[PDB]
Write a protein that binds this DNA or RNA. Structure first.
Length: 183
DNA sequence: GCTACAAAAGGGCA
DNA sequence: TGCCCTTTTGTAGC
């Protein structure tokens, strides 16, 4: 499962669910204290809960985005809790088509990387402009995943909709990272 | 408290 | 149109 002997830690999960009902945002924004709303700035009511620590963007259309959870299950859990809060408020809220939209992971290979060398050998995948951003942007094709590689050996993997995509991207990159270990 | 990246949802505006 | 808007999170040099 994990040949490199390293398991990326899941850091942020983004999901969406359909409450399947139109919502009155100003009413929700008035009844709730755990809520914010400035339509002039953004179309959603921003709401937050402590456990699991997350932030939901709630729309009039009944759709909802959930951010900040550390796992897929935590994300679904937080979404149901927001859905329960909306119900207590007077809306016939359901929970339709809950879907994990993005998973962000990170790990430490515990060795320095020669980013310049890596980018040169993988030009068709690499974006390295150190004066702009200190990390090398690696757009992997299979799985379709974006990895941010730093000189420190710190790696961020984002864009996954399944956690096995996150693990594979990392196992795919590990041998390349070793090839460009900074001695 | 910006550079960079992924992703969703919506109003607004070239 | 599509591209911002907003939110989250890791990373790191400015």
């Amino acid at each position: 499962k994990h040949p490199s002997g390293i398991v990326p830690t899941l850091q942020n999960i983004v999901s969406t669910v359909n409450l399947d009902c139109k919502l009155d945002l100003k009413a929700i924004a008035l009844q709730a204290r755990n809520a914010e709303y400035n339509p002039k700035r953004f179309a959603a009511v921003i709401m937050r809960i402590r456990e699991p620590k997350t932030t939901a963007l709630i729309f009039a259309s009944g759709k909802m985005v959930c951010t900040g959870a550390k796992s897929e299950d935590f994300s679904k859990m937080a979404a149901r809790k927001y859905a329960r809060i909306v119900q207590k408020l007077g809306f016939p809220a359901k929970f339709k088509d809950f879907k994990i939209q993005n998973i962000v992971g990170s790990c430490d290979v515990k060795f320095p990387i020669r980013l310049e060398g890596l980018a040169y050998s993988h030009a068709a995948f690499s974006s390295y402009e150190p004066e702009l951003f200190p990390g090398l942007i690696y757009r992997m094709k299979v799985p379709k995943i974006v990895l941010l590689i730093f000189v420190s050996g710190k790696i961020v993997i984002t864009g996954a909709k399944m956690r096995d995509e996150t693990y594979k991207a990392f196992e795919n990159i590990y041998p390349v990272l070793s090839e460009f270990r900074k001695i």
